[PDB]
Amino acid sequence: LAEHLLKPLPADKQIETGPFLEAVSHLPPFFDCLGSPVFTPIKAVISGNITKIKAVYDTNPAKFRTLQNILEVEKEMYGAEWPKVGATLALMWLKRGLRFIQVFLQSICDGERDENHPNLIRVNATKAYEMALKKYHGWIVQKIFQAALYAAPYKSDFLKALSKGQNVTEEECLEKIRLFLVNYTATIDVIYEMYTQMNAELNYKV
Amino acid sequence: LAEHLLKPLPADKQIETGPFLEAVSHLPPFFDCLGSPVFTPIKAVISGNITKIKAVYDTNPAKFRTLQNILEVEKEMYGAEWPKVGATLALMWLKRGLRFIQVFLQSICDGERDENHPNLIRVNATKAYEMALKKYHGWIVQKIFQAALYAAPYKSDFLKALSKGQNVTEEECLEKIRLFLVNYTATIDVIYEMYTQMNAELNYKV
Numbered sequence: 001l002a003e004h005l006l007k008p009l010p011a012d013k014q015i016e017t018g019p020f021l022e023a024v025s026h027l028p029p030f031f032d033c034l035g036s037p038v039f040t041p042i043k044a045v046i047s048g049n050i051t052k053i054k055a056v057y058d059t060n061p062a063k064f065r066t067l068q069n070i071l072e073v074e075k076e077m078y079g080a081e082w083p084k085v086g087a088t089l090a091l092m093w094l095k096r097g098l099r100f101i102q103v104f105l106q107s108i109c110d111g112e113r114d115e116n117h118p119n120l121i122r123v124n125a126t127k128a129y130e131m132a133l134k135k136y137h138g139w140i141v142q143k144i145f146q147a148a149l150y151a152a153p154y155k156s157d158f159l160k161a162l163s164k165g166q167n168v169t170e171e172e173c174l175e176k177i178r179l180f181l182v183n184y185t186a187t188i189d190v191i192y193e194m195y196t197q198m199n200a201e202l203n204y205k206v
Numbered sequence: 207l208a209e210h211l212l213k214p215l216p217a218d219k220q221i222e223t224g225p226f227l228e229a230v231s232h233l234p235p236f237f238d239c240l241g242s243p244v245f246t247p248i249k250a251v252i253s254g255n256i257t258k259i260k261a262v263y264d265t266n267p268a269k270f271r272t273l274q275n276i277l278e279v280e281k282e283m284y285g286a287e288w289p290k291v292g293a294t295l296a297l298m299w300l301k302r303g304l305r306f307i308q309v310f311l312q313s314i315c316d317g318e319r320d321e322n323h324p325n326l327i328r329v330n331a332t333k334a335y336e337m338a339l340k341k342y343h344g345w346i347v348q349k350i351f352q353a354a355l356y357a358a359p360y361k362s363d364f365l366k367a368l369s370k371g372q373n374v375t376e377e378e379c380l381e382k383i384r385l386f387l388v389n390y391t392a393t394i395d396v397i398y399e400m401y402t403q404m405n406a407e408l409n410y411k412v
């Protein structure tokens with residue numbers, strides 16, 4: 001988050017793949033900021049999506065210059081297999097990870113907390129799950145997630161972690177997150193919109 | 207499993223890194239044979255270890271010809287950071303994955319089953335966990351694992367999956383697993399032994 005930020009969207013509202021991936025590839029360290037091995041495989045899972053995208057991009061950076069480029073090339077290339085293939089499926093899942101991240105931090109900067117347990121971040125994690133991922137998952141993965149929330153940190157530890165290196169007050173640092181959240185939220189919206197427009201979203205549970 | 211098998215160990219009992227990685231890189235598809243998204247991030251997690259190993263090997267295949275080569279080069283290179291770095295830490299975790307796999311299939315070929323639920327494989331998965339991974343994990347990851355067992359298949363489905371492509375009777379196919387299990391078990395033993403000998407094992411919980 002914080003330091004290497006995604007720049008804002010333009011007229012055409014196209015997101016360049018190169019810059020996008022350079023950007024998002026900083027976000028899995030962050031799972032280290034949850035501060036537990038419980039969360040290792042999740043990060044792996046997102047490195048995964050990203051790699052799969054970078055794989056396609058690199059086969060021909062011009063041909064796949066923008067994120068739409070990918071979706072539209074793959075639609076042609078693969079049959080009715082699409083969108084359930086390729087980078088389109090990777091970005092499809094990744095955008096949901098980014099969105100979770102997005103809702104989560106939003107929730108934390110906004111001061112949504114549980115009155116009882118106010119330095120836990122389970123409420124902030126659950127709201128995230130519910131907006132970003134729940135509908136695509138069966139009960140088991142939800143049970144798991146709830147159980148993972150016990151390995152989540154207290155809020156204040158989480159933020160030291162996010163800011164680790166920088167020597168700012170917690171208050172100062174939340175402020176850095178809000179600014180991050182501006183073009184992050186913007187960008188996720190643009191991808192979500194695209195997926196709806198190109199008709200690449202899958203609405204059913206894995 | 208089955209088709210691309212690791213060849214047996216020699217006099218020196220050294221395991222060549224190239225052949226080893228070519229071998230093991232077939233094993234994550236297998237998690238697809240559990241037949242659920244619950245298990246996706248695990249496979250990612252093992253692709254991970256493997257990648258990290260292949261990364262080092264490729265920087266100089268001769269210098270890291272054998273698996274011991276790696277452990278011993280890294281010991282010198284890194285400080286008292288070692289063995290908690292590098293490929294040594296990757297192979298350290300990977301060998302535990304391979305061992306889980308190893309105990310699991312053993313257990314299934316041997317006909318260890320729960321008398322009540324005899325076509326479930328939870329008992330076979332739990333024995334595995336307990337021998338291979340439990341001691342290195344805290345209660346949460348165990349809860350999770352138990353909960354993942356509900357997304358595990360019935361035994362007979364699992365085996366169709368493992369053999370998918372081949373058109374053999376279940377009985378015939380278990381027989382293919384037993385033979386696989388010969389040099390697989392042998393090889394994991396040789397790595398476990400090495401790690402003890404070079405003093406690279408970490409016995410405490412992540």
Ligand SMILES: CCCCCCCCCCCCC/C=C/[C@@H](O)[C@H](CO[C@@H]1O[C@H](COS(=O)(=O)O)[C@H](O)[C@H](OS(=O)(=O)O)[C@H]1O)NC(=O)CCCCCCCCCCC
Pocket residue numbers: 041042045046048049050052084086089090091093096097100125133141144145148149152206243244245246247248339347350351354
């Ligand atoms: C012994 C140790 C433990 C034992 C086993 C327990 C393992 C449980 C693991 C946790 C629960 C699973 C959660 C993840 C489920 C994933 O299946 C989903 C969907 O992931 C996609 O699956 C897809 C399946 O494909 S399809 O069938 O063709 O549609 C794809 O293969 C896709 O791969 S790709 O090639 O496109 O690149 C892949 O990302 N993963 C996610 O939902 C990612 C969510 C991001 C995590 C957000 C952060 C969570 C933080 C939690 C805080 C409490």
Ligand SMILES: CCCCCCCCCCCCC/C=C/[C@@H](O)[C@H](CO[C@@H]1O[C@H](COS(=O)(=O)O)[C@H](O)[C@H](OS(=O)(=O)O)[C@H]1O)NC(=O)CCCCCCCCCCC
Pocket residue numbers: 037038039040041042133141144145148247248251252254255256258290292295296297299302303306331339347350351354355358412
């Ligand atoms: C919303 C979706 C879900 C939300 C979040 C829930 C996520 C729960 C995920 C399942 C539970 C976690 C199980 C895995 C825990 C891992 O931490 C452990 C240890 O993994 C190692 O961690 C290490 C931590 O490093 S250390 O702190 O410096 O020591 C390393 O980073 C290492 O990376 S490497 O660079 O060396 O390559 C890494 O493999 N993973 C394992 O134990 C792997 C086990 C293999 C799985 C075997 C198959 C299970 C099948 C289950 C069937 C029921």
